[PDB]
């Protein structure tokens, strides 16, 4: 059961007696979308300061494990431990992250962390193609709007930061009205609330800055061509649904219909996905996957693919977009029936895995928007209630003759112009 109390800070807890671990954490409603192009990467630097050697050493001496996660809409700082020592994690979180920040922002520590983060971002930008392609897709989809800033930070901006930027961001965003205290695993809600009440655990006053511009989607493309690479990596997307939309689960199911494909695994060549019937003959791709990502203001629905067949890219894109076209007009009931159970198993593993850190992140990110956490059972009935008419109604609105965003790198010379791709979003025979 999920129990949430608004006394003090918003305290959420999900109790699981079977687990042998307990996680206690703080989730902030600010993310990479709350920063600007001149201090971009301040959140990643804060994360790596919390994860620095001295802080991690003092934590691990007591027997605790530290996790930090940076995203568009939230920042997560989690302390995981054994069930008997769940009170010690609160003490470490109070003493280190909240009460005092002078020790963590010393000159030498800041310089070392800055040099390590610069090295990491430099390695990412050159030797991680499928993920940086998705980052550029975000950066070109939401350009000149908060949601397009990369979460790690750019190489040029990360140099200009000083400790003053970090402390300014901490003053502006680490607030009581922006925070949720989350408890996961083998702990009780009453015990957690009592433990918080015994201490003060006050973060700050409130009134975080309000953004003047809301995120917007622009049809656009960016091409980063490099002929010294062996493949071509391509990510393509349209505007999707945000969190708290009525069509959220319909979006995830429509994504699940096409699924993912790996050419080298024997089993995934026999899937009921009809798209493979066009792909398999000439080995058009090595792998693809479909995504329905949702944020607070907007979302992305699309796919990502990698291939060595540098002379047949347009055929791959054409067949994929013709499979997308089929959703509006001629989706069949068996497709939806398979999609329901595939999605239920897909959602089942996500929310019911052994690791409590994923549960903590999900619960903290959920209560910061909805105000409450949807149960597993009520999720299934909405999934089971989906019909063919709903899928057709959603697809006729979100992907029929709509603008797209594209991002590719590698031997993308075979990738045709924008308009030729944009015309594939309709059939013209219907």
């Amino acid at each position: 059961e999920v129990t949430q109390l608004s006394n003090g800070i918003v305290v959420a807890t999900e109790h699981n007696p079977s687990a042998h671990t307990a996680s206690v954490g703080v989730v902030f409603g600010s993310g990479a979308a709350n920063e600007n192009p001149y201090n971009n990467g301040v959140s990643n630097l804060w994360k790596n300061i919390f994860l620095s050697k001295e802080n991690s050493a003092v934590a691990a001496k007591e027997g605790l494990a530290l996790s930090s996660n940076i995203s568009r809409d939230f920042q997560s700082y989690i302390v995981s431990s054994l069930p008997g020592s769940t009170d010690k994690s609160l003490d470490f979180l109070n003493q280190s992250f909240i009460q005092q920040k002078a020790n963590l922002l010393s000159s030498s520590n800041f310089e070392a962390t800055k040099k390590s983060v610069l090295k990491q971002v430099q390695d990412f930008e050159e030797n991680d193609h499928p993920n940086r392609v998705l980052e550029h897709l975000h950066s070109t989809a939401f350009q000149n709007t908060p949601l397009s800033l990369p979460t790690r930070g750019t190489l040029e901006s990360l140099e200009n930061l000083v400790v003053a930027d970090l402390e300014s961001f901490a003053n502006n965003h680490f607030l009581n009205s922006n925070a949720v205290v989350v408890g996961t695993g083998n702990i009780k809600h009453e015990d957690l609330v009592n433990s918080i009440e015994s201490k003060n655990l006050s973060l700050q006053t409130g009134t975080k800055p309000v953004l003047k511009k809301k995120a917007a989607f622009l049809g656009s493309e960016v091409r980063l061509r490099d002929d010294t690479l062996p493949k071509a990596w391509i990510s393509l997307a349209v505007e999707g649904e945000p969190v708290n939309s009525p069509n959220y689960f319909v979006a995830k199911l429509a994504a699940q219909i096409f699924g993912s494909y790996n050419a080298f695994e024997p089993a995934s060549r026999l899937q009921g996905i009809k798209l493979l019937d066009n792909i398999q003959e000439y080995q058009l791709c090595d792998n693809f996957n479909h995504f329905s990502l949702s944020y607070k203001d907007s979302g992305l629905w699309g796919f990502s693919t990698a291939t060595r067949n540098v002379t047949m890219i347009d055929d791959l894109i054409h067949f994929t977009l013709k499979q997308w076209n089929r959703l509006t007009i001629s989706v069949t009931d068996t497709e939806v029936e398979r999609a329901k159970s595939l999605l239920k198993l897909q959602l089942g593993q996500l929310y019911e895995s052994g690791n409590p850190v994923n549960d903590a992140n999900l619960l903290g990110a959920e209560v910061l928007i909805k105000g409450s956490k949807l149960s597993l059972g009520e999720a299934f009935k909405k999934i089971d209630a989906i019909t063919v008419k709903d899928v057709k109604a959603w697809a006729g609105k979100r992907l029929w003759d709509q603008d797209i965003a594209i991002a590719g790198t590698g031997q993308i010379e075979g990738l045709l112009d924008y308009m030729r791709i944009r015309s594939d979003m309709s059939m013209m025979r219907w």
């Binding site: 600007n36 001149y38 201090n39 901006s157 200009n160 930061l161 000083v162 003053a164 930027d165 300014s168 502006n172 009134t207 975080k208 800055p209 309000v210 953004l211 003047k212 511009k213």
Partner: peptide, 27 residues
């Protein structure tokens, strides 16, 4: 002084800038 990131190019950055964020710079 003041942090280099904030002051530099604080013209095109004046607009589309949070009101509470821009009231700290003048202090």
């Amino acid at each position: 002084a003041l942090s280099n990131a904030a002051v530099m190019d604080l013209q095109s950055r004046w607009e589309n800038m949070p009101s509470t964020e821009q009231q700290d710079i003048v202090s």
